[PDB]
Amino acid sequence: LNPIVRKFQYGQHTVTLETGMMARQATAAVMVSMDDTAVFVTVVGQKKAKPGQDFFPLTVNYQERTYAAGRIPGSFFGRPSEGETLIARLIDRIRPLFPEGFVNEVQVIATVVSVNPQVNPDIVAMIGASAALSLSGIPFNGPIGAARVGYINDQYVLNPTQDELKESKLDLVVAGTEAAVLMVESEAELLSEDQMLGAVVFGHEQQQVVIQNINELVKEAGKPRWDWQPEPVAYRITDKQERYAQVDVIKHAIEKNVVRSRVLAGEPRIDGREKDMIRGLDVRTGVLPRTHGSALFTRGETQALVTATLGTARDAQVLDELMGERTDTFLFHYNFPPYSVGETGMVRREIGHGRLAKRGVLAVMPDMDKFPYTVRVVSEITESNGSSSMASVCGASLALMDAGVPIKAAVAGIAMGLVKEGDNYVVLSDILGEDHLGDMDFKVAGSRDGISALQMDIKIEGITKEIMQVALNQAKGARLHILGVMEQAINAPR
Amino acid sequence: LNPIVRKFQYGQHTVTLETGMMARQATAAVMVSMDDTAVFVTVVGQKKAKPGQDFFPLTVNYQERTYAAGRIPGSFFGRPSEGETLIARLIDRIRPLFPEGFVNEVQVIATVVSVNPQVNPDIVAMIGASAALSLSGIPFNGPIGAARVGYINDQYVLNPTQDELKESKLDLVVAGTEAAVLMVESEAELLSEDQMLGAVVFGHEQQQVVIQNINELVKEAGKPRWDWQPEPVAYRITDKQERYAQVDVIKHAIEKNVVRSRVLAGEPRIDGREKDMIRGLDVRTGVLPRTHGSALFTRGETQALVTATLGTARDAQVLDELMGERTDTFLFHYNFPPYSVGETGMVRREIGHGRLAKRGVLAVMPDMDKFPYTVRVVSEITESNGSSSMASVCGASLALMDAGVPIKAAVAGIAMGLVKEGDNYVVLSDILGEDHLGDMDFKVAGSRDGISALQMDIKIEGITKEIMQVALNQAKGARLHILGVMEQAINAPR
Amino acid sequence: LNPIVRKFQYGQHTVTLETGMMARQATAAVMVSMDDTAVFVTVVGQKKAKPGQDFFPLTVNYQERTYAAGRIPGSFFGRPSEGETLIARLIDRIRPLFPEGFVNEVQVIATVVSVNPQVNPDIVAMIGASAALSLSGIPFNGPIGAARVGYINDQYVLNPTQDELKESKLDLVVAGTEAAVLMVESEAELLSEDQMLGAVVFGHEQQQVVIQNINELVKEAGKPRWDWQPEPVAYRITDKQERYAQVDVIKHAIEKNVVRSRVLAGEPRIDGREKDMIRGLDVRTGVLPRTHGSALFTRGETQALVTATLGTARDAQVLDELMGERTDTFLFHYNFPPYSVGETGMVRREIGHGRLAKRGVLAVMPDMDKFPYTVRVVSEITESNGSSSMASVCGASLALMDAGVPIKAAVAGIAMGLVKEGDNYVVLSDILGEDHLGDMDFKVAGSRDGISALQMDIKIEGITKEIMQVALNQAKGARLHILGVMEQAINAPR
């Protein structure tokens, strides 16, 4: 047996890339260690695809073994936990790098086998997944880097530890290729637009050492490239329920292109709006009798019914996590029933949308010194047509004020889209479920003073920081418009 | 946004019907509030049915949110609970109102969003489901009413509260249309046949105010009616295992009609019995060595092996329910394995049959003052050919006496069927799995003195109370015959 | 109703065979009681098989009812437990007795309905399953006997009780027909090869009274035999990943026969080895930073990453089992991911392989007097190509020594195969995943002095004890070769 080991300095720590010894039957297997935090990541891609497979099947499995921290599992935790699904989501969000037409089934399995309580295994697993896909031979336009950005003493900190974080005003996670940023997931204490954008650029520049070191391992121990080639080559309908039913022609690529051009040229959108227009808002407070705090927020065809519950300090959820024991005082829940889009089925991505809406509200939540009560917020999505997660942020803010929770300020969220081909681009405000037919979509949540949460999902090459500068500026004026309408129905708690 | 609100007095309380504001993407969504008990009920019916769908797909989902009582969920309760499935069953049992030939997939989702501890959300959810289906436009021959009937001081009480119930001798739930009763589910402290029938008629008369007020909301805010039209138009085999195997012709509507007429005319049934004849009974006691209390009850081709277990007061199941904390001292379990009907599969309706058999025994169970021990009863269905739930009632009574539990009296159950077309009708005693091919089926469980449980399922228009008067009278003499045979093998506890 | 009862003396106890009274709708149902330990076993075989069914579907369901011990189930235990799946596996391992070409779906359901704390229901369930299949009429070349063999005071004890076991040096379970042994599952305190083989022969001779008494019940109350007749009638590829991919011809019985003859004649195996050659070994210790005890064991194309965890006496798993309360101080876990064989899927037989590897290590584990700490061992199968369970035994031994656990000696495991047709036979050492294409496969785990675990799976008629004598002797020299290589990398704990 022969192990190929390559080491490098990523920020403060030393990252070890190991392959060729363990799990050889898989397409590629990489042992990535970052100061004693080791995550074993594997990748398997099937040679022949199922004849007439309509979509690209990608599954990312992230699992935390408790023996990594030197502890024996308890009578309690088959099914993955809430946190494990979120980190598997952070990895998956590598998906748009597979070439268009690639339909082979591919599974990425990342297991935490050793852990340091100060080094978060989520970045380690993302580096391992990037190394596995690049060494595999499977058509993949990487490798990507993985970076966590902090903000201590008005300066950006690369990969802050759990102790450093406590002093940080930002918990940003950024992933992207050598050319452009692809994934961003941020949590912030009401920071400005430039401070959030500065962290995205900073993290993308610092993660370049990860991409270079994987590329060298690829040239040294990488398997040959796959023998795969791609196969050679409703206007006035505003209501989503009425549009989708009459669009079912007996007889997708043309459906994108027609909407694409009718926004690039600069004419009315699908529903009939200008590029920076927000849908009709309906705000209601105190809608359910026998609850503490309740709120109904409606934005065009997207609606969320949100509630708040006050409990004692003993009602706090004690989460036994791998990194350490953690007591959660603020709880957030997200429900997405099939009737929200007019469908029948099982009573998705609820964990991802729930945490995103939680991060948009967490920054404005009061201290345990001023408010020593366990607060739980549940969002019920009654209607969905564009970003029900940001509607939960608005609904939570009104529900907390209805309950009597003295939050620092009012908080709102907004979804933004972007269409680009040449030098000309258009940033759209309050996008419809427009989301599929685009280049990038990003959600900004924050108060009147700053930003609490920022999520980005880019799929196009060559987005400049000047284009994102303008994109966040329109997003700022978008949420200020929502907060102005919110400020009228409910302004103060109790 | 525009909410349409209609209020009315249902009994003691005020019922609010609200629609047109929440969940507009669904076919219909109704917010029903009864004195601070609010259940949000939605309905979605697909426009086009799956080509060549053989059965009518109906799914009722009832869920209780804990924030309704102003409480935060605990580390414990995806899957619905035992009580939530039973209430979803109470709603579902609306099914025979969809026109014959309607095969479109339709899902009804009812969620308890606000709750008053004195007003049971189960009746509230049934009113909401009746309002949703009527406002939807989906072919549905309603609306139905929902009523709970109590019996305090020899007088019928409409919708008794949780405190009133404690003084009631009856917990009856009745649902039906403006013309006839459709669903009954009763629990009683050994009441007479006329007292049980009087409650069914009383509840059907009182629930008429619900039907009228939904109908007015339908005329005001109801969506247009659906553009749907229906498509235009083994004798001596007594053994069920031998009949079903040889009936599989290579080559259902004719199979019903042939049995229908051969009972309407007045000739021997499928197995060869008269209309009021009970199958062969086999009663055995003390059949398992290392149990407390054990009993084997056989009725023709239906068999149940039942056991009893004695435990301390600490072994009682503490059920944290939405309405309040509840300690259960009498436990009942029901098992329906695939071999009971000669099939292979997963190791259905066990919760419904388990509670029905529990309600048939609960009335005869001794007090905690005379018997302060936690008693658990488990029924194992070894054979099934007609009503294994009533066989569990007989089996439980013998198992309790074998264990040494001093029950008030012996208790037995019987399933009854009815075939009707003109003025001539025939009520059948101890029906075979005859159940599918009929108009109504009802199960009566009780002692020699009174009735402990009464369940009804009607699917035909125009059943008079005089026909039910005769039907319950034959059911009385049926269980007295079973109790006479039971009284011989086991007569006294200890 | 008429029950047919036959009783006989099996060893110390009295075994009751009862049929014809309970569950008549099933193909056959038997009530088997062994001194108050009663297990109700049913069998259902469908008459017509699904047109073009490619494999034989057999499902064994073993379930333990808690009312059997006279106890009421607690708020805790749908899904079967760890122990229930293992006993269902002990029954299933009857499978090779169904004639070749029999493809009908058949389910065997065994339920423990009464239990004596001194008589293990696992042997009782195996007798019941043998009686059910023989009385059914379903083509089945039985009946089989079921025997547990102990070793107290240098003498073999038939069916030792739970108290006797404590004094036994062996916990062997043996099942087979009147002609030959079929299934063996052993746990031993470092016993010699002849002592283990002597127990297999002893148990097969003692279980003959079970086969004879079932056969008499078959002649008395057995259903007629089924009207079923059978339908009338890559050399140098060493790498498993390279062989399986290029073997997929467009165009199994010939694939077996070609390998069969090329081993019977006496020429190089599929990978190119002699009959008694072991694959290349790679042993590594201390491979994961932030664990207690860690080990990587590689054997050709089979690899296992194993870890050990040290905890306090309070961290011990308290297993509330049917026979009694049991505290487990040594924990073993087994993981089989899809990438171990180069596949994509859900993240099988892990419980069976986990317990087999546990039994191979349990004998060498130190006492609670010398080492009063809870030890947990987890095996991660990174590569699989022949017997990843025995690779876990080797990996566990090195991981315990790395953790500092003072185990009595070093322990290793080896998988063995056998090919036979005439008087000439060949026993193979360290078989590849060769396992499907054979007559019997057996795994021997033990130290330098004795044997800790012995599992056998025979599918052929006429294996003499002299052939097994030679087979275990080659297995002895096989594990001594592995222990010699292991003894070099890691020799002492701490």
Residue numbers in the entry:
A (entry chain A), B (entry chain A), C (entry chain A): 2 to 78, 82 to 97, 99 to 238, 257 to 274, 298 to 393, 398 to 483, 485 to 545
Paste lines from the article:
One widely occurring ribonuclease with such multi-functional versatility is polynucleotide phosphorylase, a phosphorolytic exoribonuclease (PNPase; polyribonucleotide nucleotidyltransferase; EC 2.7.7.8).5,6 PNPase processively cleaves single-stranded RNA substrates in the 3′-to-5′ direction using inorganic phosphate to attack the phosphoester linkage at the 3′ terminus and liberate nucleoside diphosphate. E. coli PNPase core forms a homotrimer with a ring-like architecture that encloses a large central channel. The two RNase PH-like domains within each protomer are spatially related by a pseudo-dyad axis, so that the PNPase trimer has approximate dihedral symmetry D3. In the current study, we solved several crystal structures of E. coli PNPase core bound to its cognate RNase E micro-domain, including a complex with O2′-methyl-modified RNA bound and another with manganese in the active site.
The RNase E micro-domain is also well resolved in the rhombohedral crystal form with Mn2+ but was poorly resolved in the second rhombohedral form grown in the absence of the metal. In the RNA-free form, however, the helical domain is partially disordered, which suggests that it is highly dynamic and may potentially become more structurally defined upon substrate binding. In comparing the RNA-free structures of the PNPase core, we observe that the FFRR loop is dynamic, as we find that it constricts the pore in one apo form, but it is disordered in a second crystal form. We observe also that RNA binding at the aperture requires two channel-loops and may pre-organise one of those to engage another RNA base as the oligonucleotide is translocated along the pore. It is likely that the S1 and KH domains may also affect the conformational adjustments, since a comparison of the structures of full-length E. coli PNPase and PNPase core in the RNA-free forms shows that the central aperture is expanded in the latter.
